[PDB]
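[job 0412] stage=fold_complex status=start
inputs:
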Amino acid sequence: EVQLQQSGPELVKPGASVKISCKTSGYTFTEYTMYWVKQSHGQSLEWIGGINPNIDDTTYNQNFKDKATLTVDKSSSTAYMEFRSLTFDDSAVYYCARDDKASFAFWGQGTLVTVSAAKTTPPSVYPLAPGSAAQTNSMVTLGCLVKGYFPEPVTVTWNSGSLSSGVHTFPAVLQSDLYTLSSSVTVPSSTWPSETVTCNVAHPASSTKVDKKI
Amino acid sequence: DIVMSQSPSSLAVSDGERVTLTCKSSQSLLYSTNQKNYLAWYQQKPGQSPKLLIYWASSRESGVPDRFTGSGSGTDFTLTISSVKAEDLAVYYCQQYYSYPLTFGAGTKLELRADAAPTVSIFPPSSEQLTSGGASVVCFLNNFYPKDINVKWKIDGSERQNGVLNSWTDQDSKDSTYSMSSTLTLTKDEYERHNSYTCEATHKTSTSPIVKSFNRN
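[job 0412] stage=fold_complex status=done
writing structure:
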């Protein structure tokens, strides 16, 4: 019906300025207003502000004072949003909201804007194995730790996609401007340690691929 | 500013039961000229855009199925679902359009059921970790329910809270369960000054906490 195309993810350093666009198609730009909603902490939604493209009416929230200034484009039929003085708390996903009527509002796909003072490092992985000689469970669990990579994401598979069942991927945590994650799969005792398993991690931003046999 | 509160935060439901959500505002959101209530209910899928379901808190939008209906006016706002489906796993919000600035709700998420519990996932540190100058012992909590759980790290009988990195996952799509990892990192000479490391976790379905430990030497 109406398409709200935005920009992609951006890797910015703290101190610079980022610009977020929201392309409009299928409807006239000079009739309806555009709003912006900031989504923080996964679930919490914060209202940024709004702009009327015809009469240049601009209102902003008290939490976004001297930070967000809204600008519209009357020739390319798109909206612009720029941020000033980016800090560590601005790591959030931003959406453009189309205020058509009081009945329905359309949304975009969102722009992932992460900010860190951070260099791209190859991930260092270490295999994990239980140090006990015997156990009571019929299943043996294994894993491998992924530490020291930037940026998100890293695709972690097991045995080249053959051991797809029973895999558990944990979300990353930011520690000293770099993310760390882990994974755990369940293996029956009839294979380990007679049959070897491998960890396959992939980083397309660094173009590396290291295989660790456990 | 007009602030809104939502209750409850989370609730576990089955397939086919009735779900009622409550949104409460501190002031009246009723406009007296047209008897309209300026509040709309939201619904956001994991990985998709948030969409609207109920506008003016009592009417249904085109494209929304007949199971989503709303009632209430002024202060109390209720969203009642007649029969939930498998695709109803989403987070709901309520937003007022009465006065500027606009505020959002706290967020309500539904869960599934039930009865998952772990026993042992203790992993000792490997030999490749100590060559880099550090040490890291991990504790996973796989196949556990509910997500309300407390983890505790014990080192030679002493409690240590610094350096604990917790990570929770979402609900599984196969057995409707959760998974949680807890990683305690430290330096290399602190690992050699201690022998025993106890991984403690307390659960709701058990009357005794599960204790398990391993030795270095």
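[job 0412] summary: The CA atoms of residues 78 and 151 of chain A lie 29 Å apart.
[job 0412] exit 0
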